[PDB]
Amino acid sequence: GSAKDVKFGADARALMLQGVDLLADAVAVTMGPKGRTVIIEQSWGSPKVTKDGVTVAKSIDLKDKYKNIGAKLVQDVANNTNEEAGDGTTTATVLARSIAKEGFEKISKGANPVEIRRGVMLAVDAVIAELKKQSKPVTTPEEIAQVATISANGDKEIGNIISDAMKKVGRKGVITVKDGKTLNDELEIIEGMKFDRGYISPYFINTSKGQKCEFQDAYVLLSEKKISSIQSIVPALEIANAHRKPLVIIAEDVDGEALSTLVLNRLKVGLQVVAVKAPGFGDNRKNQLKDMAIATGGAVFGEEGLTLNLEDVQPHDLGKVGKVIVTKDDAMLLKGKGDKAQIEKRIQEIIEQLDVTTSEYEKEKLNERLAKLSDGVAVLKVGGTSDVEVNEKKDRVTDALNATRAAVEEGIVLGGGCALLRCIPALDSLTPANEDQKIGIEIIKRTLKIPAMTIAKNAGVEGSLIVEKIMQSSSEVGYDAMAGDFVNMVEKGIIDPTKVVRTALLDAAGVASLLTTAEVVVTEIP
């Protein structure tokens, strides 16, 4: 293969550690309320500004291949943490560096770094245990706004708006975040099954106020093929006029004589029908119409395999919806009836789809919003006066969102970094098997102090003074670095979801303790 070059021992370890230390030093300035932003040049456009540890970490590759190895591993931890939890990234980086440094330094000739890794992992199990003991599950929706506001770097309006969206859509409902055009944040809530397709003809309009087609207790007909009728529609219309309910028709298109029958029966003898084009496009539209089929009940017509033909319809082959509103641009269907079991099965199918599949073909999420819209969905249109502002802010909002979900699903624990600090005594009651493992437990014991000392150091204060003052102080009190003084933590609102504190530590220790095991490094020649 490619010509290569290799390096041995503490020299190579010092190189990789130089890379780790550089990347960590770049990431760590973002930490906490008094933390600061990092600008990253974009190749094509105007530069990014960010406070996100992981996005800083991903941006830094290094010319020196060994230092780049260190860097790659540290961004690996930060990325793993962002994927598994969505916050706690800077923390995962500073922990990873601490374990890597304190690890590397303790290595000698007699030492056994794999066994030291074993000791470290013992220490991490033991700490996350005590963390779970410390966790108190969230209750009041004030705590939600608190977790959001701290994860959003002190922006109260963010955690308020997140609290509102999470109330009105639910704690495990769908909230999504995107650019506003407004200079301010907006919360919009959609209910139903909305998609961007409108009536084919104006003649379908009934209300004259808004120019909408508005129906209730309606039927829905779903056709995967075009309907340029062979009069495959008429039984479907006779069945609708029979049970005196309005009919909405969704199809690849409604065309030719079909439409003529539709707006003749519409303009004359006032029949209640509307027809709209399928959401589109191509193979996606199949999945969408089958989604709406399963949600609203009934069955999709046209060729899948077993072909259900439009000539032979029955009322159990249509669909049933509480309400329908359609305009020139979009169509919304509301309170559609079908098997809820089948709906939760369906969303469980799409999430397990999207989760394994990775082309940034984001429509799989556009599916998920649609079929989950019968609880509701919230769109978070973030404001600001400029694209870069909008992107930084949106990074923070997404962080706070993921943080609130982690808080709701696992728990909350003390903020600042105190939650890890309180776990040290649990390490003090450990029973190491040998010197190596003892070294590992010592490494974790030192590493736990880091996040709090870093948040304080960013403030411009003597962080390690503050750590020890906190340790001397009672369990409920910690350091408010923004206010610049000690306070009850939970009362003042400084709290972190337990899941992120768990995952940052577990990932960071997980890769760094492996990094410390290295004795030989092999890299490509420039």
The contact set with Mg ion (CB under 5 A) reads 87, 151, 399
376 binds ligand ADP (CB under 6 A): no
Single out the segment in contact with ligand ADP by CB under 6 A; choices: 28-36, 134-142, 170-178, 291-299. Answer: 28-36
Instruction: Tell me: is residue 516 an annotated ligand-binding position.
Output: no
Is the CB of residue 300 less than 8 Å from the CB of residue 308?
yes
Radius of gyration of the chain (CA): 29
| Residue closest to 20 by CA, chosen among 93, 123, 103, 117 | 93
- Residue numbers 10-49 binding a second copy by CB under 8 A: 16, 22, 25-26, 29, 33-41, 43, 46-47, 49
Q: Which of these segments, 57-65, 176-184, 361-369, 475-483, binds ligand ADP (CB under 6 A)? A: 475-483
Burial code (b: 16+ CB inside 10 Å, e: under 16) for 280-302 equals eeeebbeebbbbbbbbbbbbbbb
Q: Which stretches of 127-281 are assigned E, i.e. beta strand?
A: 174-179, 186-190, 194-195, 213-223, 227-228, 247-251, 254-255, 273-277
Q: Which stretch binds ligand ADP (CB under 6 A): 31-39, 138-146, 160-168, 315-323?
A: 31-39
- Specify burial of residue 355 (Cβ count, 10 A radius: 0-12, 13-18, 19+): exposed
Binding residue for a second copy, selected from 18, 206, 241, 523, defined by CB under 8 A: 523
What is the closest distance, in whole angstroms, from the C-beta atom of residue 140 to a second copy in the complex? 26
The 326-345 site mask, x for binding a second copy (CB under 8 A), equals -------------------x
Residue carrying the six token digits 């502002």: 389
SS3 of 282-342: the string is: CCHHHHHHHHHHHHHCCCEEECCCCCECCCCCCHHHCCEEEEEEECCCCEEEEEEECCHHH
Query: What is the closest distance, in whole angstroms, from the C-beta atom of residue 109 to a second copy in the complex?
Result: 5
Question: Binding site annotation covers 88?
Answer: yes
Rule CB under 6 A: say whether 150 interacts with ligand ADP.
yes
Footprint of a second copy on 394-453 (CB under 8 A)? none
Query: What is the distance between the alpha carbons of residues 462 and 22, in angstroms, rounded to a whole number?
Result: 22
End-to-end CA distance of the chain: 14
Amino acid at 238: E
Smaller CB distance to a second copy: residue 43 or 429? 43
Q: Give 455-459's long-range contacts (Cβ < 8 A, gap of 24+).
A: 455/31, 455/32, 455/33, 455/34, 455/35, 455/416, 455/417, 455/479, 455/481, 456/32, 456/481, 458/28, 458/29, 458/31, 458/32, 458/34, 458/35, 458/36, 459/32, 459/33, 459/34, 459/484
Binder of residue 179, out of ligand ADP, a second copy, Mg ion, none (CB less than 5 to 8 A by kind): none
Q: Which is nearer to Mg ion, 252 or 399 (CB)?
A: 399
Shortest separation between residue 421's beta carbon and a second copy, angstroms: 22
Subset of residues 405 to 424 that bind ligand ADP, contact rule: CB under 6 A = 415-417
The reply to whether 90 sits near ligand ADP by the rule CB under 6 A is yes
Residue type, 103: G
The one of Mg ion, a second copy, ligand ADP, none whose footprint includes residue 91, by CB under 5 to 8 A per kind, is: ligand ADP
Candidate list 17, 20, 24, 60; residue touching a second copy; CB under 8 A: 60
Tell me, rounded to whole angstroms, the distance of Cα 56 from its chain centroid: 18
CA dist 314 and 295 (Å) reads 18
One of 18, 241, 265, 517 touching a second copy (CB under 8 A): 517
Instruction: Round to whole Å and give the CA distance between 78 and 38.
Output: 16
Q: Identify the residue among 332, 379, 426, 482 touching ligand ADP (CB under 6 A).
A: 482
Interactions with a second copy, residue window 475-514 (CB under 8 A): 482, 506-507, 510-511, 514
Residue pair 236/254 in contact by the 8 Å Cβ criterion = no
Residue 140 is assigned to a ligand binding site: no
Nearer to ligand ADP, 134 or 296 (CB): 134
Interacting partner of 41 out of ligand ADP, a second copy, Mg ion, none (Cβ under 5 to 8 A depending on kind) = a second copy
Per-residue mark of binding to a second copy, 137-176 (x: CB under 8 A): ----------------x-----------------------
Q: Which residues bind ligand ADP (CB under 6 A)?
A: 30-33, 35, 51, 53, 87-91, 150-151, 415-417, 455, 479-482, 494, 496
Sequence ranges of the binding site: 51, 87-91, 416, 496
